[PDB]
Amino acid sequence: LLIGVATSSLALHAPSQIVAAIKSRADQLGASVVVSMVERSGVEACKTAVHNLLAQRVSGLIINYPLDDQDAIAVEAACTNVPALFLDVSDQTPINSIIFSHEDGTRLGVEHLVALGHQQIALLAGPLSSVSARLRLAGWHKYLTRNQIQPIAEREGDWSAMSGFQQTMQMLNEGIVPTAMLVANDQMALGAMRAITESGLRVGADISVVGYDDTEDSSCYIPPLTTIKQDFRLLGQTSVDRLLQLSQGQAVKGNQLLPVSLVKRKTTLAPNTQTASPRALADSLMQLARQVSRLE
Amino acid sequence: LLIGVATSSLALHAPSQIVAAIKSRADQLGASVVVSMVERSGVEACKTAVHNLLAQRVSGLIINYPLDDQDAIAVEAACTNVPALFLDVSDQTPINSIIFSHEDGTRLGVEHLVALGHQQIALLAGPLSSVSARLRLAGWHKYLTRNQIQPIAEREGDWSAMSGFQQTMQMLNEGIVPTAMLVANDQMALGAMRAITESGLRVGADISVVGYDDTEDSSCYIPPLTTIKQDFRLLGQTSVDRLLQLSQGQAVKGNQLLPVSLVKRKTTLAPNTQTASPRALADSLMQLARQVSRLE
Amino acid sequence: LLIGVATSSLALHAPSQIVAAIKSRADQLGASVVVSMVERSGVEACKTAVHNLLAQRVSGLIINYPLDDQDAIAVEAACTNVPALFLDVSDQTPINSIIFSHEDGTRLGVEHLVALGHQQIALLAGPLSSVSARLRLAGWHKYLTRNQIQPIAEREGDWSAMSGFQQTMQMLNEGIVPTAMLVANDQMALGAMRAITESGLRVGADISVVGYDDTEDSSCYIPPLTTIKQDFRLLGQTSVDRLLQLSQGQAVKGNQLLPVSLVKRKTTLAPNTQTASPRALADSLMQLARQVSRLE
Amino acid sequence: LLIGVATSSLALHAPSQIVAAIKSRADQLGASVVVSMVERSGVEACKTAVHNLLAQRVSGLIINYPLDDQDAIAVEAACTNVPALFLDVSDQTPINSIIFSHEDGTRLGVEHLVALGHQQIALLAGPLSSVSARLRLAGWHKYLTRNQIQPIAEREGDWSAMSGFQQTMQMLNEGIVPTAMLVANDQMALGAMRAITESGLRVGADISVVGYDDTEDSSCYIPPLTTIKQDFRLLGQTSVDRLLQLSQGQAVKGNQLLPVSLVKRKTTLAPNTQTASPRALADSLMQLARQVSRLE
């Protein structure tokens, strides 16, 4: 029948790619997706959509929206019969979740830099208002502090490439210069790198970066991103499918975790490979001088 | 009070930003929004999404998906009375379509590079199976031949960054070196930029790149992107606004054309052949100075 | 005797200085001041401060707190029975208040920049949750639109020096380089100045700045800041006296505007930036180049 | 419940930041703060302030004011039945005190100037009526003389910037030119910086300056200041936290010494030409760049 989705209200790549995916599995099964957008931020925001969908004679809610444990439980209580699958909650909460692995995404990342030798790492998290955002953060710690490393810089962006740009800009001007950054999403990485680059730094060779999501543009960032990929095509499938087993089968309740993996691209290198430029920056000042004279 | 939206399934940036704008205005004017995603298969798929929208008892429709005139005429028909505003057809198409000036954006893109002094212009458009991606291509022509120049090479991506990277690497790896490329959208320009930088070509100073759209991430594209900005918020207000009025008859029929703008950033410079410029030489220095800060 | 003061518990200097002057004038009169502090919320945070206060059996109340018109009416009523004088509200309110003229402050700042020939002016607003900041920006405008000028920058800070830095820096990175900025307080002005300076620009010559408070430090900011002086001492004496007479039966009640002025210092100059930049730029780059390499 | 505070009615940066950090913690605990202000006077103004807080019927007392020998002891004596916790006396004080390490603070500052290679050190001490001002100067000396160094000159300011400025201008027009100055507070270090800059000297490269406190603004002073950070956020919490213990019943007595650090920023460097300075040079290339930029 009709599967309803509650999602962003902001055009973020990860939430969009998962919708595109849900809508994609629905086709191969002859099912109809009817999407509802959740008013910017909140609890009573998801509720209105869950009312809106249950209303549109749907048969299964895929809550593609961030809710802290109490809220999630407070929203599945709203979807009455219409079974629900929470795609963004904690894998500890009492609903039918289907979360991506944060113990591993964080471990795989925290682990890559370290084996490369990095000990001066910085953390760039998404709004801590977001559960997944938070969990991603706790993981960062758990593992850095379990590999004997306490982060030199810990910031909070809002998923945007520009808050990723801004945040690294401010961090490097506060004086903190990590050899590696652990970023909570792929767009703040576009930004952290625009930040890193326009400082004289070389992403990888000077300041490394590992994103999270491996969203579509990522392979094409102008130093392609080493990321923690979260297969949204597989997520969309796995979910449409478990959703149907809630109503049209036996709700084998609990939470399922999808795997995650490190996509080694071109933004991570061992620290202090170092080129800082001695008579070299002089060399350059000198080359622009003659151009500067050629000017006037 | 229920805008029904037929939107693409493709997870491209521009259309999701438009959806966020249409829904923001939903929230503001008291109305509701229900989305039905069109798989990329013409009106056949579009009109079915129209049926499902029309089945949830939507007040009116916003069909935001590329309809080929004659397809547009048909999607419309299947919106049985219910008012339909078209966000992606031809202004030259006899239906109710609000459309960004395909004539302005292509003039500004061309006019920008001619004034900088480029004569060797390469064109990279989206999939010719799109009126916007045909109306854009025709547009680069009117003004290239007008300002007396024919495109040295022209390719076709699919709106994604990978297609930009590849087409440009092909043109580039085929012997063709343009000084400025006029790219259809912003995601694809992300990739032009990468094919440019991986061939030892500095985007901007060697091969300038002009995008189109100005999708939220564009300003953090490392060399921030110069682009034809198309305001998607304005689409969110004019469409929702007009949809509600439309829905209540009021003879404001046919196409309405919207403003465009050149958001100039760091990807367009005077060609490989000038000097550098007081503009390009000031930037060169400040990154050198910034390195001199850390240097010693 | 006892005059209870309800104040901002965030340590911004301007309000510290008013509480200080109330302590100063209550001392002259043989009176005691008791400061209750307000959490960062709205009216219920100021209201409870009134109850914390009222309870101490105070005879008058001075609300040194940004109330949003209607909320001033609410606190005015919570702390009734006892005479209440509001110091950070709008002159439009049906309460006893003592505000500093915003029309002047905003004109004086907008006019000194104009007589000097500034055309590209930027605006640094305080958090618009503040009725004061909210009012400073309106005039920046009223006098700028009445002088043929439109701001080419409109940013908001939270009053700290660091938010002043981030916003001036963000704007210069966005590409906007105004000849003068009209800042809303001296702290953001310090940061704006620290921003302009680390960009290679000159406070005064390349970018003038006009703060707004004439806080104690302003005299010693690197380029001694030219500000709109708000005399918190005259404010502390008049507010105390007016409360002690309201304490009695002496009305003369409603809204009362204290004057304000423009303290010329060093940050203001004309945009007569000597455009000289002779072929001397090259030779001078040259020396800096040798200079750079000498220590490496 | 209620904690009364006897603070300085002079509006200084740090004392205002503690009173805030006291409010913050008092908040988290369900404690209600009432502030009384102390006009500078011996044990006198403080005894009457104590009385006002006793009249207000408070649970405990936090005395945040510069109390001398038997001043602290008399003010304690008048604090009948309410426990008094002092924030500004000495160690060698038989009262419940809690202040930052002056042995550590002055040691780190000094030995930071001695590791960079200076020997010509200046002192801009605070007003000698403050116990900590005189403790801070004791420490400048103790460690100055243990590193075989002896200050070339020393000054007394009154904690404001205008005084640092004058005390610093005075010594500079007296022939005494130090390679570094150790200053009692950042507000005082601000004017010393104005003083140095105006005498044609480059703060940091000519006269390194080390403040003490790290009040909010410092991170944004022109050359951002190197300071002995004193965390008022902990003084505020430990004070309120301990204050209630002493009256809860867990009699936790005597003085407690909170740790301190040095925040290295941009006002300290080594003194020299075979230094030629990296930030000095860098500030110059961006000034040059911002001069080439306007070459059109």
Provide tags for this entry.
homotetramer, 296 residues, alpha/beta, Rossmann fold, 4-stranded parallel β-sheet, 9 helices, 42% helix, DNA-binding (chains A, B, C, D), cis-regulatory region sequence-specific DNA binding (chains A, B, C, D), DNA-binding transcription repressor activity (chains A, B, C, D)
Notes on the protein architecture:
4 copies of one chain form a homotetramer. Chain A has 296 residues and is an alpha/beta fold. The first copy, chain A, folds into 2 domains: 1-100 and 230-259, Response regulator (Rossmann fold); 101-229 and 260-275, 3-Layer(aba) Sandwich (Rossmann fold). Chain A has helices at residues 13-28, 44-55, 69-76, 102-115, 131-144, 161-173, 186-197, 232-247, 278-295; strands at residues 2-7, 32-37, 60-63, 84-86, 97-100, 121-125, 154-156, 180-183, 208-210, 227-229, 255-258, 261-263. A 4-stranded parallel sheet of chain A has the order 2-1-3-4, with helices on both faces. Chain A has a 4-stranded parallel sheet with strand order 7-6-8-9, with helices on both faces. In chain A, strands 5-11 form a two-stranded parallel sheet. In chain A, helix 5 links the parallel strand 6 and strand 7 (154-156). The radius of gyration of chain A is 22 Å and the shape is elongated. Chains in contact: A-B, A-C, A-D, B-C, B-D, C-D. It is classed as transcription regulation. The entry lists the keywords transcription regulation, DNA-binding, repressor. It forms a tetrameric assembly.
